[PDB]
Amino acid sequence: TYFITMNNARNFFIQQLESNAQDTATSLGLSLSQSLINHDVPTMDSMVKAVFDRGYFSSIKVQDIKGKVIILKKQLPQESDIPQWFVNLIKWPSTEKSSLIMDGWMQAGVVLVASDPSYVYASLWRNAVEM
Amino acid sequence: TYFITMNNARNFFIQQLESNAQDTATSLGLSLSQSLINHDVPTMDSMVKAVFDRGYFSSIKVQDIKGKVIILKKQLPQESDIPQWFVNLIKWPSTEKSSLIMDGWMQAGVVLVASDPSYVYASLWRNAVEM
């Protein structure tokens, strides 16, 4: 039988969650351009909600140049039946990734996507085997 | 030391690659709407290239109602230093996911995203431990 060490599986999720937040922010940066320029909040909300409803993100933030937050989706990590000792073994901090929302060559806004590491803890706990 | 079985790690990637292709297709479906309506091929190409340059996809296809392919990005799985016996152990077929490109309530096109399972084989091979 073949296995993967917990340490290597953890390194995958650390890297995957970080790059997924960046890739998501970059694609939202292109997707939101026209709606941000024309101040179409409902269209911007649909694009963000489609991404945030995936469930992997702790926060998604859209703001114009000044820092004026236009859209803000947030969720907390919630209660867990995972033992705290195992949570302390695998946990790692969340990282926020950004991408500029452009209007041609001019800056128009920023979209920020933050990962939710606690989204993966339960799957690592249920699939863990000790040897 | 904690481990994950190869079978459980494989089930994760089977599920993750399939849902990632679907989530990507759905977000592209919203992102490409205005450009498809106004027939802005360069803007559509930038949105697709940002997603396809990620490297996880075997193909991304944008077409109007009729099946007229507007954008087509493809890549083959390439040569591997992975032994064929291990490739046969973990391999699984690619799946194509679709999302409609809408213009309000009217249909305008379809975007199709296909996964590339062979993208993950090398990482599973380099991280594999037998017990």
Author numbering:
A (entry chain A), B (entry chain A): 22 to 152
From the paper:
Specifically, c-di-GMP-bound LapD engages the periplasmic protease LapG through its Per-Arnt-Sim (PAS)-like domain, preventing it from cleaving the cell surface-bound large adhesin LapA, a protein mediating cell adhesion to multiple substrates. In contrast, c-di-GMP-unbound LapD adopts an autoinhibited conformation and loses its affinity for LapG.
The structure of L. pneumophila CdgS9Output (residues of 22–152) was determined from data collected on a crystal grown from selenomethionine-derivatized protein by using single anomalous dispersion (SAD) phasing (see ‘Material and methods’). A potential biologically relevant dimer involves a crystallographic symmetry mate, burying 3020 Å2 surface area at the twofold symmetry axis via favorable interactions (estimated ΔGint = −20.2 kcal/mol). The protomers form a parallel dimer, with the termini lining up at one end of the complex, consistent with their connectivity to the transmembrane helices that flank the periplasmic domain. As a consequence, the tryptophan residues (W125 in P. fluorescens LapD; W126 in L. pneumophila CdgS9) that form the distal tip of the PAS fold and appear to be a main anchor point for LapG binding are farther apart in the P. fluorescens dimer than the L. pneumophila LapD ortholog (50 Å vs 35 Å between their respective Cβ positions). Closer to the membrane, a cluster of 4 phenylalanine residues (2 per protomer; F33 and F34 of CdgS9) stack in a perpendicular fashion, as opposed to the packing near the distal tip, which involves the burying of two symmetry-related arginine residues (R75 of CdgS9). High-affinity LapG binding to the off-state of LapD is prevented by an apparent surface mismatch.
